[PDB]
Amino acid sequence: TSPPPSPPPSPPPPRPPPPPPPPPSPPPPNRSPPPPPPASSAINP
Amino acid sequence: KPCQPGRYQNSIGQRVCKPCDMGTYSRYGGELCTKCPAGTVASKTGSS
Ligand SMILES: *[C@H]1O[C@H](CO)[C@H](O)[C@H](O)[C@H]1O
Ligand SMILES: *[C@H]1O[C@H](CO)[C@H](O)[C@H](O)[C@H]1O
Ligand SMILES: *[C@H]1O[C@H](CO)[C@H](O)[C@H](O)[C@H]1O
Ligand SMILES: *[C@H]1O[C@H](CO)[C@H](O)[C@H](O)[C@H]1O
Ligand SMILES: *[C@H]1O[C@H](CO)[C@H](O)[C@H](O)[C@H]1O
């Protein structure tokens, strides 16, 4: 006698998870300070 | 009188010496504060 109807294609796995978040991006470069004012002249006599 | 250590004065005819910011030192009266050499430190602003 002939066999039965051959089975279907079994499903795939339930699929993996996603990637976690990234770290906090670093801070901007520390800005430099300004220039010293010019040398003032003598005070009033 | 000359400026005391830790102070500088880069102008003529003034009656006040100014203090040196952190990272710089100064001996007895000098025109400008000189940065600490490589390998040495100075924390405060009255650094001598
Ligand atoms: C199913 O199989 C048998 C023999 O295995 C026969 O050929 C039948 O004709 C077929 O339907
Ligand atoms: C599919 O499966 C059946 C059995 O159910 C049989 O082995 C066939 O030969 C196959 O094609
Ligand atoms: C996976 O499923 C198919 C049919 O869905 C078949 O029964 C296989 O035997 C099973 O491994
Ligand atoms: C700042 O850097 C982090 C990596 O630590 C991340 O890629 C951010 O998207 C970026 O803007
Ligand atoms: C000015 O100062 C900041 C931090 O002190 C930084 O080094 C810059 O490169 C400089 O130009």
Using the mean position of ligand 4's atoms as its centre, give its distance from the Cα of residue A27 in Å. Answer: 10
CB contacts, 8 Å: B15 with chain A: 43
Give resolution, Å, one decimal: 3.0
A4 annotated binding-site participant: yes
Phi–psi pair at B19, nearest 5 degrees: -80, 150
What are the tokens at A41?
């002249």
Return d(Cα A8, Cα A29) in angstroms, integer: 62
Name the one residue in this structure whose structure tokens are 């430190």: B41
Surface-to-core class of residue A26, CB atoms within 10 Å of its CB (0-12 exposed, 13-18 middle, 19+ buried): exposed
Do B13 and A42 make contact, defined as CB atoms within 8 angstroms?
yes
